[PDB]
DNA sequence: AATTTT
């Protein structure tokens, strides 16, 4: 397996070390490039040739980043006051467990049943916390529940998928099953043949059940016993005081941060079979710390 | 983050010094080019590289103007003024409105950024919103009434206006996250990726719209989830057809006045967000 | 402001010497470009730089000759009872000389909401022929896509007259046509140069049947008939036209303008304070004496 | 209108000596060009570049021998009861003399509004047959393709006529097909560009059934039909043609078309002097000598 | 007509020595290129020149190879009893020879009206085996893609053949689908181009079920019943095959083919005076003397 | 048979070693490429020529790696013991000699089994039936996935693929023309997207389904005219009994040890059932499974 | 872009 000679003239060995000041400096896409330099862009974005460099260098950065390290080092790199805790006690969770279950779902360890399902009433904390998890990932990708024929776009490369309001008929049930599970598969694009997508972490938020497919219009549950093999639930019960805001990417930080001194004791024996409904918190609270 | 050395021929240092002049003197459009420079359009116009660099210009002239001081900066007798006989007429206070829409255009007003029409037809609805969108420096139009493709080409634009469009159901949720001022991603029919940071809105429609119709019954439940951030703007009896268009520079004027006065008025209007003025 | 300083290669000043050829000849179509001058247009066809240098050129040269300049006086450059269209227009029973001032003050824009101009009635009527004679005259006109689905507004940019023929309001862009037939500006997509911001352009429609009625589909609903008739002229014709009437050339319509252009604008400005739907029918002492 | 002074390089020099070449070697179509030189055109197809400029070659020396030239002289150049064309035509009872003359008059735009053809029979009755034959005589054909709804009218420019083989007229592309078969200038947008200014092309259709009625969906409608009647004349084939027939040449069509241009030309003045829908079928009465 | 004299650098030359050795060497496909010379093949796909030159040479020699000659003499080049397309035939109760002369005859387009052959029967009665046995003798043939309703007749302009495997005529193809069938030159549409030249190609088609009745919707209608039938020549296969016959390869073909050939043809024109629908049946009392 | 006399460039040499380094390498795909020589694909992916010879590269290296060799020496290749493989022990569970079964994809890999090209996996769910599909997938050289909702173009993806993989399987009334000529296996030509029609000589084809697929629906409802046709050309398994939450993602390394075990052994039980297929595959026999792993 | 796509 040694590496072909290659060489390569000046333009090459520029755009080797442009890739590698891309993917040190965590750049990831076409804003946060235009924020943190302009004079490159602008320079670039004057030729054919320079303008499509940038779409280049920017995945190759982002192949780079995801494939040398887990997730985990780009979510790591007062405890008992932050949003989250907070949100999730009073929604009856241990914020400890769904950390660990979070830090294991995204490294794609969590077997089949790697997906994170949160139903519950709306406009009770569903959207903004996975919004606040997929911000912090260097890129994310948003499924396409409609179209009935693209349902899967900007999904392939991406390193997790989010679905709000998510609707599931006959005809993604079973092709979905792959992807929710973490299975690698191909998936077409449009105007293309096939991606090659390896499995991604996929979070789901929907206010009406998912398990019963929409037949058209008479919903007939044909796929009960299949989809729920692949997805955990933690139902959502009570609201929440409309200023709470962008949870931004600092809480979110610590909060996985905090699971870096503690134990997994309880996680492995729950490993042994995986719920489908995430187990509700009863007496287990109160963290030294909390 | 350390700049990158980029050391690069003497055509990217005269990109570079087209972008700044183009920024400089405020060209954010073709027309505007044409108006204002024939001679540089005509000589760049010769070939696919000077169209391509014309069309790179623009993008980067009009980022450049975004990203660097917030939009008002490119605003800023009293009742001989147009706008403020129309307000007068369409039995709406034009100091509320004045004071709403300077802290609406800034992304500053926590998360009360929507504007909206309907009303009565033919009631200068277009004329008000086109003045407005004239003024920022630019907009991007994009219709409802596909309630499926409806986010189309608004990603890269200040302001986003809808001259047209119908509130289905498919599209309820997504709207939830454009109207609130979120970024998202959203198709569009043609390209795969949009990566939308969320921008300010205004819509203009003629029909009922109001609801948040699911099929054929609305759904009322989901109207309060828009409606704590969706306060309304609504017109009156029509207008003469005398009055024409509206220009810009009376905008501006209306706007400079408005400046000045007090802002306690809508600070206690802030209290209670009622969905009509 | 100050022009910018660019420098251009010898190639730049000669294709802006080649626009300033074409600004000054009135040359405005690729057809006109081959009859005056084809070893020129043969010269630059040989590459694919020459077509598109051609198309640059032929846009930049309608851009400035456009500029400015009202459209009527490129329709006002060159007995009466005679004219073909004159005796078009009176067996339609409609005022020859109220027809032409309203059609000068549309072209330019100086009308109002009332920005087109429909041209309904059954078959072998005129119509078509009217339209394409008005259209002929001006520098450039363009059309309508019958079905294109993407770009159903092109080449209405860069125009000085849309000639919608056989037309239909599709419920797909019938939110795009109650723009365009307004005359506010609106953006289109141009095939490559995504949105146009147009500034808007005079209308023409012509028909066999009614378009207010937009189909939905399949069924015909009647919502949107109210704002379209709101900003809509009609003109109906009724009388079959002779088999061999031939197609009216340009020459035609500059005299029949010519001859409107030099005559009292008082009856238009009587006929201004309201807009009818429908123009008034012929009357027997409101017509010109030289058509007596 | 003195001609632009610009002087081009050697290549364009040698494109305009080709041009030239394929102008005055009567050489329209690719296949012409494969068969009388096959070195050029593999030269030249070795190249990106080198094929755009074959394209364009094609079509500028298609615009120089066509422009103000009547097409009916390419048509024009023994015994004449021997004729393949007029017998089949006797055997359908048709005068083969006033088709002829009514084909001349018609391929030059000279007939007014009735600027179609229509043949309508059962199968294998010789309308696709004759109307091919036609169709290879001019110096190049457009086609309307059949199934493509979105450029439905694609390569009808340049074309000095099109063939509507096997075509039923559809509610999605009816404004088109009004548009075109009519015979007045309009503007249809082609690939790779935006509208081309068609100035009027004679069309030609071949059917089994009735067109003048419009399929939509799964229903028919007739609204169109009064309006299309007009613009076409109808010649019914009947009688079955035998097996070993073959397929008409050139030849045939030029020497029928060359015989019948110098007989008389009173009859048909008369019968043109009010053009009916359906062609009058032969009479017994006239019988011209050289046919009976 | 005098050739051009226009000459060409040295990559012309070496890409018209190119198209000879190509053309020489019986290399009409890609697989065979690859097959027999794989070094120039690497050599040439290392550029977008490489592959634009593989596409025209393969192109221009597959054109000169196969014009002005009979297509037969490409299927042209033991006891003939134990040749496998001959079992085949006895176990369906035809006469090879008749069957064999048929195909020469259908090949080079000098059948008539019917330049369609069928085969119609139960499933797995070697009906694609043949179908595909014969195609693999000509240059290149082209099949019908089923699924795609905007381009259904692509990869047919320059096939010396056409395979329609497993068809069915849907009711907005049935137009294009006529005329293909026909045998007669048109023009085709295709993707990133605007019409190609097809001079008319045997079309053979196989099937499970009727084809002549055309799908519409969710019903089936008959309209186009007599239309179809009579371009078609039908075969009925029954009698289920070996289960392990194989792929019948070229030689099979060449053989059975040059073995009917060499013999007389007097049996054939008795039939071919009047073509029918239904191929004759066998009688035992006519067959030739070898096969007895 | 003499090659063309033509002389390439240094460019051109450069880009045949390549070819030759990537036939050599076993590298016929894009990810295995970034994996193993990132640093060269960075250099290549600078210019749009460089793109250019990816792609041409990668299908030039497939074609010379798969034109002659047959796909059985790629899955053979090259001890633990024989019942520690999990394939071995999952076929043993669902009642099948694990003997014929790898005999026969060794023979159906190879277009060696008549007519028959499809395999048809039917059970209820989750009793492993994409896990073993897709580990036979993973060890060809390249496969390819039916699409699922392109209705348009259901066969773009079989283009020069070693193996296609069609899961959830549910053939349409519109689709059965273009599934039917792909199953029967024999040279065809299928069209692509935005050019024209590609060569496709055949291609084995793998299927797994939670219901019956002989039976095709039109509209709302289910015909069964395509019924014997389409069994005709097909070997169908049963996946009855039910697994536990246990195999972690069968690796395609197992598939080695349990082919070459069982290329191995004498094959003189399988002719006596490949001189006649049957539609369904035959069951366990007791008194007849080899003693090395009872 | 046109095709594909609905
Ligand atoms: N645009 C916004 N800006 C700030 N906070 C918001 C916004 N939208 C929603 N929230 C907060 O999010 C919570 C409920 O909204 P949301 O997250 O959408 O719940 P949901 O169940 O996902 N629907 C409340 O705490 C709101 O204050
Ligand atoms: N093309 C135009 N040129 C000049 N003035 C115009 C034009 N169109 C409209 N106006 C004027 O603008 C005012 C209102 O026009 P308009 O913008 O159409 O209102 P609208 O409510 O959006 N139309 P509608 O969609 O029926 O409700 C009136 O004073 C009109 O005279
Ligand atoms: N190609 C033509 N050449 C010469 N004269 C023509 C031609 N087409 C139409 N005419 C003349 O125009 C008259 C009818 O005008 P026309 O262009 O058909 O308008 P129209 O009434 O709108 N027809 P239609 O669009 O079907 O309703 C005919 O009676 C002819 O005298
Ligand atoms: N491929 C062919 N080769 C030779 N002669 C042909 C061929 N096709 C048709 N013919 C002759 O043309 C006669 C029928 O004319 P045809 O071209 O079928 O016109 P048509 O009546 O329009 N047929 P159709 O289009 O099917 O309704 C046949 O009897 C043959 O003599
Ligand atoms: N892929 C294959 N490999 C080897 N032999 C084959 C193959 N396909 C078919 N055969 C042989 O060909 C015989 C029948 O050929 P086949 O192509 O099925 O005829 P067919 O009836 O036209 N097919 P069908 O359309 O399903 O009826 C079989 O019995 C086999 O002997
Ligand atoms: N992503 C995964 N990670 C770990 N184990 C998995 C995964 N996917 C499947 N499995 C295991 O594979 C076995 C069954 O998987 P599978 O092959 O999908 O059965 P199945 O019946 O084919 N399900 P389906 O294909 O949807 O009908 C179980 O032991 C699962 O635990
Ligand atoms: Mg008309
Ligand atoms: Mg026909
Ligand atoms: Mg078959
Ligand atoms: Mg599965």
């Known amino acids: 397996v040694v590496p072909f000679n290659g060489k390569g003239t000046k333009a090459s060995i520029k755009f080797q070390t442009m890739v590698n000041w891309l993917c040190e400096n965590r750049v990831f896409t076409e804003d946060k490039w235009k924020l943190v330099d302009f004079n490159q862009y602008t320079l670039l974005s004057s030729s054919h040739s ?9 995945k190759l950065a982002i192949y780079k980043a995801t494939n040398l390290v887990p997730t985990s080092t780009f979510l790591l790199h007062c405890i008992k006051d932050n949003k989250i805790v907070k949100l999730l006690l009073c929604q009856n969770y241990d914020p400890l467990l769904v950390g660990q279950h979070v830090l294991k779902w995204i490294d794609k360890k969590c077997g089949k049943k790697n997906t994170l399902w949160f139903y519950g009433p709306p406009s009770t904390g569903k959207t903004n916390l996975a ?13 396409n529940w409609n179209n009935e024929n693209f ?40 105007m293309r043949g096939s991606v090659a997508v390896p499995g991604v972490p996929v979070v789901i938020t929907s206010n009406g059940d998912i398990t019963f497919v929409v037949s058209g219009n008479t919903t007939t549950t044909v796929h009960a ?9 933690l139902n959502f019960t009570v609201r929440c005081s409309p200023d709470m805001g962008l949870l931004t990417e600092a809480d979110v930080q610590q909060w996985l941060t905090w699971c870096n001194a503690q134990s997994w004791d309880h996680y492995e024996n729950w490993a042994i079979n995986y719920t489908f409904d995430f187990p509700g918190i009863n007496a287990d609270a109160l963290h030294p710390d909390l």
């Open 50 to 58: 320079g303008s499509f460099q940038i779409q280049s260098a920017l």
């Open 131 to 143: 919004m606040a998890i997929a911000k912090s990932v260097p890129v994310y990708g948003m499924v």
């Open 151 to 190: 349902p899967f776009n900007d999904v392939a490369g991406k390193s997790l998928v989010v679905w709000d309001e998510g609707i599931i008929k006959s005809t993604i049930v079973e092709a979905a099953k792959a992807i929710l599970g973490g299975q690698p598969t191909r998936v077409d694009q449009k």
């Open 225 to 233: 016993k299949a989809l729920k093999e692949r997805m955990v639930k």
